[PDB]
From a paper:
The Maf polymorphic toxin system is involved in conflict between strains found in pathogenic Neisseria species such as [name] and Neisseria gonorrhoeae. In the MGIs, the MafB and MafI encode toxin and immunity proteins, respectively. Since MafB contains a specific domain (MafB-CT) in the C-terminal region that has toxic activity, a gene encoding an immunity protein, MafI, is necessary to protect MafB-producing cells from the toxic activity. MafB2MGI-[name] is a polymorphic toxin present in [name]-2 in [name] strain [name] and it has been shown that [name]-[name]-[name] has toxic activity.
In order to infer the enzymatic properties contributing the toxic activity of MafB2MGI-[name], which is the second MafB protein encoded in maf genomic island 2 ([name]-2) from [name] [name], the X-ray crystal structure of the complex between the toxin domain of MafB2MGI-[name], hereafter referred to as NmMafB2-CT, and the corresponding immunity protein, [name]-[name], hereafter referred to as NmMafI2, was determined at 1.5 Å resolution with 18.0% Rwork and 20.8% Rfree using a single anomalous dispersion method. However, the N-terminal 53 residues from Ala270 to Ser322 of NmMafB2-CT were invisible probably due to the degradation of NmMafB2-CT during crystallization. The overall structure of NmMafB2-CT2 has a kidney-like shape characterized by an RNase A fold and consists of two central β-sheets with three peripheral α-helices. The structure of NmMafI2 consists of a four-stranded central β-sheet, one strand (β4′) of which is relatively short, and three helices. In the structure of the NmMafB2-CT2/NmMafI2 complex, the α2′ helix flanked by α1′ of NmMafI2 packs tightly against the shallow groove of NmMafB2-CT2. The interaction between NmMafB2-CT2 and NmMafI2 is mediated by extensive hydrophobic and hydrogen bond interactions including eight salt bridges. Notably, the residues in α2′ of NmMafI2 contributes approximately 65% of the hydrogen bond and salt bridge interactions. Upon complex formation, approximately 1110 Å2 of the binding interface becomes buried, which corresponds to approximately 17.0% and 17.5% of the surface areas of NmMafB2-CT2 and NmMafI2, respectively. All negatively charged residues of NmMafI2 in the complex interface contribute to salt-bridge interactions with NmMafB2-CT2, except that Glu74 of NmMafI2 forms hydrogen bonds with NmMafB2-CT2. These results indicate that complementary charge interactions are the main driving force for the formation of the complex between NmMafB2-CT2 and NmMafI2, and that NmMafI2 functions as an inhibitory regulator protein by blocking RNA from accessing the enzymatic cleavage site because it binds the substrate binding site of NmMafB2-CT2. The dissociation constant of the NmMafB2-CT2/NmMafI2 complex was measured to be ~ 40 nM.
Author numbering:
A (entry chain A): 5 to 103
B (entry chain B): 323 to 423
């Protein structure tokens, strides 16, 4: 992951990480100038998750939009093992979980 | 673009506000976000671009805040309109000034 994206996500995630977030990943498509953000939750998604992701993208683009023009997100209920989530590419946030 | 500032969302970006989150981009202390928003609707402040998620970007023409990543002053704000109202996020000037061919 490019440093600008880890910086931007570090700041944007301030104040929106709650205990049911297992993993947040970002996929950066440089030629398309597009970002895909995935929020892996330990519960079904709620409307506040979508609001929080919209807030996050607004902040991230305001800081880092020289690098990307569009972004999409997904909120995913995952019951996969801690080992599996530990190995997904693009993690900018990963909760501590027992192996 | 909505007509009412959502204070709870806007306050994340106002130092000393009850909702402020230290580290985020901040509006300057003398900046009234509702006055900026009223000036967008009155035509004082033009929408010059759109950012991700189709957010309008406005050039206010004078400093309105500073970017949390660069620390730099900016004249530009990203306009976020939701069901509970609007908030303005100071935009890194490079977001506007570094333009692809």
């Amino acid at each position: 992951l490019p440093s600008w994206l880890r910086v931007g996500m570090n700041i944007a995630m301030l104040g929106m990480i709650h205990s049911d977030i297992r993993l947040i990943t970002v996929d950066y498509e440089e030629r398309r100038r597009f970002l895909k953000i995935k929020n892996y939750l330990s519960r079904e998604a709620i409307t506040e998750d979508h609001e929080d992701m919209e807030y996050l993208i607004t902040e991230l683009w305001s800081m880092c939009g020289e690098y990307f023009d569009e972004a999409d997100f997904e909120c995913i209920y995952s019951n996969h093992s801690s080992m599996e989530l530990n190995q997904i590419n693009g993690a900018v946030f990963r909760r501590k979980e027992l192996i | 673009i909505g007509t009412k500032i959502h204070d709870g969302a806007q306050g994340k970006h106002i130092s000393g506000h009850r909702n402020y989150i230290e580290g985020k981009s901040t509006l300057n202390q003398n900046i009234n976000p509702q006055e900026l928003l009223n000036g967008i609707h009155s035509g004082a402040y033009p929408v010059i671009s759109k950012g991700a998620r189709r957010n309008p970007v406005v050039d206010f023409g004078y400093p309105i805040g500073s970017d949390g990543k660069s620390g730099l002053s900016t004249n530009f704000g990203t306009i976020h309109s939701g069901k509970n109202g609007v908030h303005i996020v100071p935009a890194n000037p490079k977001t506007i000034k570094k333009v692809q061919l």
